[PDB]
UniProtKB/TrEMBL annotation:
This is Alginate lyase (PL7). InterPro entries: Alginate_lyase_2, ConA-like_dom_sf. It comes from the Eukaryota. The keyword Nuclease does not apply. One of its GO terms (molecular function) is lyase activity. Alpha-D-mannuronate binds at R116, R139, Y201. The gene is PsAlg7A. Disulfide bonds join C77-C194. Residues 14-219 form the Alginate lyase domain. Keywords: Lyase, Signal. Pfam families: Alginate_lyase2. SUPFAM superfamilies: Concanavalin A-like lectins/glucanases.
Amino acid sequence: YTAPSTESKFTEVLSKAKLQYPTSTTVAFADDLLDGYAASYFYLTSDLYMQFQVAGSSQRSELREMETSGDEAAWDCTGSTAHVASAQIAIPVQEDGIEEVTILQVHDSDVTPVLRISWVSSITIDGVTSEDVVLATIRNGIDDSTATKTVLQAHTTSRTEFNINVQNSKLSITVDGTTELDEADISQFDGSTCYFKAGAYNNNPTDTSANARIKMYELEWVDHH
């Protein structure tokens, strides 16, 4: 397998990441990734996509945001400093039995995802069913398992620009340059710290042997002061 590190467009984000697979345990740290880490679940395609692939319920092949110092990313979820994740993602047609795949997250430093962006085979929101869409899920609180869900985009196989902007207790998502979630409130994470994630996180498959698969042509995360 060809390593994503062979493409300079990924050098910086890999320097600022560690790879988790198939669960929360890190399999490759930044220096491992930069030294050519590659596997069936994480490799560079011939047309220069970083592809994540994983099977199993709640299993993942996922990059977790890091500082170049080796510190885990842990920024104030609702602080004044803006944190931005940008990715160009091609979501292929998912294999039979794959029902939801999380491709980007804002996660707190414990057990709660602030935001998941995920492809879903179907979803029903306030009595409206949507099929084959890309979704934003924002948990209502650490002690509230419920979430506010928002359809962002009809699923396409085409390469799509996703931007997550977090600042001052609000979170915004743009898709191909169009705001699809405008300053959603995340004050329920006051006092939490946060980090970005990107990859393939397989949610509630009906075939635990099927492979979820997500491709990224560009990926970066930054802050601005």
